[PDB]
């Protein structure tokens, strides 16, 4: 086709060098196609090295190509198809389906690099995300157009933490949700394509509410790379273009950190620290600043991280922990203590949590929860050795109100019909404040720790009180 | 020159459609309305209290 | 003004102390106070007045 | 006055295309001869200056 | 209309374009454009490519200099004509720049209209020499009254702001600032500290909110805010602090006084090793470039209180570095803390327990210390650090049966850890820290209640106020407490002790 034809020189993994002509002109961050019995593979052009020969990176596999092998040049960063056809639809990384309802794409395609919106165009905002999730929306207040982060160690059901997201906030939500996986395992991704068809996001019929982007681990690292920056672009489309808010979600991106630092090293751009790549902060960054509350649109991403061993001094958990908005981290103890969610909820800080900010009440019942919590904490070392009995009654008492409020932390989860058998609980965020309030002043210290475990609200709690007692 | 040519392009053809102030009162927040001066605060009203004042504290506790 | 007031106020708590059955005196009293500190709250609490025709 | 800000940023950038239109205009034009020709002389001229 | 403004700035650019010497990009990746040409071009030199790029040019190497692009490589290709601008980062400098986000180049990205300040002066100069400084001697107030009191700070120096990640490093920063408003008000210029904050790598929604708090508080008409966002490229990363610093120069030069926070050199450090390393040039210690104590070093020692033949100015600097895991054994906190006088680290436990400020008194000291601290507020808190000191070690017989006179301490201890609390983004001024430290000096507050400290201390002040604005306004300006006012304040704890 185009004048720019490249014949293939090195096949040297993933890198593959291209000898493009010397009257044709290529340019760093285009996309190469090269017809193939496998699609079009795609080669992102990422430098140029003399005499036109660049050296690009594969998005799809390398297999069985020749060396001397006819290149047509897109001209441009990989272009998607954008429209409002990209709901309920899956869409891998070159843009193709993987939903198979044929031709995705209204009338546009976008390319998937673009700029992250400077500082005039920055709008801010202190509006208020709920989850209906009443242990996080008390002790980790959420934000409307933020960038939650789901911090964790080892896959602490990180997909069913954000299914319940999804099946709480999602359907609530009125705009659309993007849900992007990065490298994500395909039986996890037959779960949630078959989960959302049946919470119904993915509506067979009529319009989703989310948009789906499932990558997969087995597809080559650059296109683990390209994933991230597809699904990115898609929610800028439906932030600045539909002009609706939206509710990212992306997954997991410590698997998009892992891809970049292979890519890096295979560029010849020797890794940095613990093997990270050297670029690791602005690639983080480029991603970061183009989510955010523009005056266009408000997108809320909420991003899962893997934190390798559990250890988030790991320069690349630490990194990213930095540049989200509003982070959590899940624990294995808690889990195992049977509450779910797992959060730990004194590893967890919200930055909206300022006093006046979630309301004076809501600060002083946190500041008071928070503490309870943190006295049977640091308490539970003295009951342990020394005794539970030795320890004061006011103490003791403090303690038997923080084992009811940490089973009543204890919401049973709707996406935990199939991990637990026992329903949702949705609660509103007044109901939660003033049913925590309640607790604390000991108002309820006459209903058992158990008759909180794995139940709801007050009500709930009275009831399965009552229940019980029955 | 190029430089002629473009700012005399420019200049010359010139497009501004202009956008109705009905399309403005949409992307605007309309003018909200007199608070009225209502009833005003008012304490100590009908002679209900009066007697009751009056007969329920007649006396102090001996 | 309000500052004679609420020195006769608490003056009459303390005598209402000397006393008994004006124990609901001294809440009524509670009650015009706070009154006062909140108009003077809502008095502080007043915003221009009119438009801002020089400028905006 | 949020749209009336908002409405000047629009009419720029809307106004921006519309240059584009004339620049596609501008190079195809024999102005593109006639300008270079312009600019050939000016160079002739400037760098003689040189 | 205002296009018609641009189109005419547009005729205005007609400039002969003989470049004397161009280059051209032999090839470009990883933004290490190598170009042939560039003959007589000076080290570090702005370069501008076809693409508009803006460069320096730090490898000359004798085949092809090697740029590195500040811009993105986007647009860049191959055979790029890369004129050469011929000038050296420079960056206006002058007053022009008071309440006015702007770039490194100097662009304002608050979009505050067009940069006009005094001259542009280059990025990078070296420190001022021995002779052309004078001892510190003038104190600084930053309204947090530990800070005052603890580790009083002076002008024309550093001294660390070292803690751990989003503890609000940047809240304790912040609420400095805020009380520089207050001096800032006041006419001596050496009062006028003219703020410059400098925000390294942080997100611009971040950065917006900051700007949004400043103006809340009216604060951007001092404040400067040197703005190197997380998108912002590492060059500028990199020359950030001393394009900054050059800012700084022209206050100190007209020998005014002000300071420059460096929030946080950390993320200055991961993008020199983003340079190094796209240099191919060995990473140092702890895969942070070997000459990052040099960095650093060249630019902390232009943080500097000159002499009084150098019209007694200073540019006083407050340096944030981020650890990790609290590490300042890290090799980047390690070398800082060399090169720097003082340091104050935040202890995490004690931001968790709200004490905000979350301050680790014993890791915090200052060199310069009580040589810049208010007499009056010398006089009242030397005690203060021995009482906490015995109530650090009386902190351990907080686990009971104890001696009268540790109880005593205990006491006395916890009411002074909430006396030091200050809500943060609320400020206090010197001429009430001091009142309230001797009422704990004096054991008032001992005997006061712990829930019933805040009570007392709003309303103390107000008491004080009310009963002697004279004694607070003669304390405030004095600036000394003389016994006659001490004892003053004795009587007046008292007669509100009794109240």
């Given at each position: 086709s185009t004048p720019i034809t490249g014949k293939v020189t090195a096949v040297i993994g993933a890198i593959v060098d291209v000898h493009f002509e010397q009257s044709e002109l290529p340019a760093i961050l285009n996309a190469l196609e090269i017809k193939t019995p496998q699609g079009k593979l795609v080669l992102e052009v990422a430098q140029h090295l003399g005499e036109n020969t660049v050296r690009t990176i594969a998005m799809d596999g390398t297999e069985?190509?020749?060396?001397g092998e006819k290149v047509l040049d897109t001209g441009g960063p990989i272009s998607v198809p954008v429209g409002?056809?990209?709901?309920?639809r899956i869409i891998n990384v070159?843009?193709?389906?993987?939903?198979?309802?044929g031709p995705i794409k209204s009338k546009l395609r976008k390319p998937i690099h673009a700029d992250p919106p400077s500082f005039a165009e920055q709008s801010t905002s202190a509006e208020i995300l709920e989850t209906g999730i009443k242990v996080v929306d008390l002790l980790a207040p959420y934000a409307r157009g933020g960038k939650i982060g789901l911090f964790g160690?080892?896959?602490?059901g990180k997909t069913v933490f954000i299914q319940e997201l999804i099946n709480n906030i999602a359907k609530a939500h009125g705009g659309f949700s993007v849900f992007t996986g990065v490298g994500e395992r395909t039986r996890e991704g037959n779960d949630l394509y078959r989960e959302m068809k049946e919470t119904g996001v993915i509506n067979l019929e009529g319009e989703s509410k989310v948009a789906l982007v499932f990558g997969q681990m087995n597809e080559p690292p650059g296109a683990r790379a390209r994933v991230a920056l597809t699904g990115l672009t898609i929610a800028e489309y439906f932030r600045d273009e539909e002009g609706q808010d939206v509710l990212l979600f992306i997954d997991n991106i410590f698997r998009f950190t892992q891809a970049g630092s292979e890519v890096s090293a295979l560029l010849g751009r020797i890794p940095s620290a613990?093997?990270?790549?050297?670029?690791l902060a602005t690639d983080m960054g480029l991603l970061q600043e183009r989510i955010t509350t523009t005056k266009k649109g408000s997108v809320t991403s909420v991003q899962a991280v893997y934190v390798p061993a559990d250890?988030?001094?790991?320069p690349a958990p630490a990194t990213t922990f930095a540049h989200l908005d509003a982070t959590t981290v899940l624990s294995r103890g808690i889990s195992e203590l049977?509450?779910?969610?797992?959060?730990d909820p004194l590893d967890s800080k919200s930055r909206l949590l300022d006093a006046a900010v979630v309301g004076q009440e809501h600060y002083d019942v946190a500041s008071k929860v928070q503490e309870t919590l943190q006295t049977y904490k640091s308490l539970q070392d003295i009951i342990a050795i020394l005794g539970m009995?030795?320890?004061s009654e006011q103490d003791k008492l403090t303690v038997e109100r923080a084992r009811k409020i940490q089973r009543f932390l204890s919401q049973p989860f709707a996406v935990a019909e199939?991990?637990?058998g026992i329903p949702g609980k949705l609660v509103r965020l007044k109901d939660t404040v003033a049913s925590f309030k309640a607790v604390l002043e000991g108002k309820?210290?006459?209903?058992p720790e158990h008759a909180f475990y794995m139940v709801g609200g007050i009500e709930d709690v009275v009831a399965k009180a009552e229940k019980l007692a029955a | 020159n190029v430089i002629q040519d473009l700012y005399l392009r420019e200049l010359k053809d010139t497009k501004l459609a202009p956008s109705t102030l009905q399309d403005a009162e949409g992307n605007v927040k309309p003018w909200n309305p007199p608070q009225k001066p209502n009833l005003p605060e008012l304490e100590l009203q009908g002679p209900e209290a009066l007697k009751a004042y009056t007969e329920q504290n007649v006396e102090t506790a001996h | 003004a309000k500052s004679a007031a609420n020195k006769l106020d608490w003056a009459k708590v303390i005598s209402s102390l000397r006393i008994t059955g004006s124990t609901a005196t001294q809440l009524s009293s509670f009650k015009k106070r706070n009154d006062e500190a909140r108009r003077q709250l809502l008095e502080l609490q007043s915003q221009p007045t009119e438009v801002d025709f020089s400028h905006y | 006055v949020r749209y009336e800000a908002s409405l000047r940023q629009l009419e720029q950038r809307q106004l921006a295309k519309s240059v584009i239109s004339r620049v596609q205009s501008e190079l195809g034009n024999p102005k593109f001869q006639e300008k270079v020709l312009q600019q050939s002389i000016s160079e002739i001229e400037q760098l003689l200056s040189k | 209309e205002v296009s018609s403004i641009l189109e005419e700035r547009i005729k205005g650019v007609s400039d002969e374009?003989?470049?004397?010497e161009t280059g051209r990009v032999l090839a470009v990746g990883d933004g290490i454009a190598r170009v042939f040409?560039?003959?007589?071009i000076q080290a570090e030199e702005l370069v501008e490519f076809s693409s508009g790029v803006k460069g320096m040019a730090l490898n000359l190497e004798p085949?092809?200099?090697?740029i590195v692009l500040f811009?993105?490589?986007?647009?860049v290709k191959e055979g790029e004509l890369v004129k050469?601008?011929?000038?050296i980062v420079d960056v206006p400098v002058g007053?022009?720049?008071?309440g006015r986000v702007v770039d490194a180049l100097g662009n304002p990205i608050d979009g505050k209209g067009p940069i006009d300040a005094a001259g542009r002066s280059r990025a990078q100069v070296k420190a001022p020499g021995i002779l052309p400084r004078r001892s510190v001697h003038e104190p600084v107030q930053t309204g947090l009254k530990a800070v005052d009191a603890l580790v009083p700070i002076g002008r024309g120096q550093r001294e660390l702001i070292i803690?751990?990640?989003?503890?609000?490093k940047t809240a304790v920063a912040l609420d400095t600032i805020l009380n520089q408003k207050r001096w800032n008000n006041g006419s001596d210029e050496s009062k006028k500290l003219y703020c410059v904050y400098v925000?390294?790598?942080?997100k611009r929604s971040t950065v917006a909110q900051l700007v949004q708090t400043l103006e809340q508080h009216d604060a951007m008409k001092y404040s400067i805010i040197v703005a190197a966002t997380a998108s912002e490229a590492a060059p500028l990363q990199y020359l950030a602090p001393f394009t900054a610093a050059s800012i700084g120069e022209w206050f100190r030069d007209n020998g005014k006084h002000a300071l420059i926070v460096y929030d946080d050199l950390s993320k200055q450090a991961v993008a020199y090793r983003q340079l190094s390393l796209l240099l191919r040039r060995p990473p140092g210690?702890?895969?942070?470039?070997?000459?990052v104590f040099y960095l650093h070093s060249r630019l902390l020692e232009r943080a500097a209180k000159l002499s009084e033949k150098e019209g007694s100015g200073s540019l006083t600097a407050l340096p944030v570095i981020e650890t990790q895991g609290g590490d300042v054994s890290a090799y980047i906190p390690t070398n800082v803390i060399s090169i720097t006088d003082g340091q104050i680290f935040l202890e995490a436990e004690l931001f968790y327990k709200?004490?905000?400020?979350?301050?680790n008194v014993g890791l915090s000291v200052s060199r310069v210390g009580s040589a810049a601290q208010v007499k009056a507020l010398k006089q009242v808190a030397g005690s203060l650090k021995l009482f906490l000191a015995q109530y650090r070690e009386v902190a351990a017989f907080a686990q009971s049966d104890l001696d009268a006179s540790t109880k005593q301490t205990l006491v006395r201890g916890e009411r002074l850890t909430q006396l030091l609390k200050q809500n943060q983004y609320s400020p206090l001024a010197t001429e009430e820290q001091v009142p309230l430290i001797y009422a704990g000096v004096n054991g008032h507050?001992?005997?006061?209640?712990l829930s019933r400290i805040g009570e007392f201390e709003s309303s103390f002040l107000s008491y004080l106020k009310s009963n002697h604005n004279e004694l607070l306004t003669e304390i405030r300006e004095k600036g000394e407490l003389s016994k006659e006012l001490l004892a003053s304040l004795k009587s007046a704890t008292e007669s509100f002790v009794a109240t």
């Open positions: 069985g190509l020749v060396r409002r056809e990209t709901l309920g070159i843009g193709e389906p993987i939903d198979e309802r160690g080892a896959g602490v613990v093997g990270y790549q050297p670029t250890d988030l001094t790991d049977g509450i779910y969610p797992a959060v009995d030795e320890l199939v991990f637990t309820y210290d006459n209903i | - | - | - | 374009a003989n470049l004397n040409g560039l003959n007589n085949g092809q200099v090697g811009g993105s490589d986007r647009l050469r601008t011929g000038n007053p022009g720049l008071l803690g751990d990640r989003q503890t609000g925000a390294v790598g942080q210690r702890e895969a942070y470039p070997g000459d709200g004490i905000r400020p979350a301050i507050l001992d005997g006061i209640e």
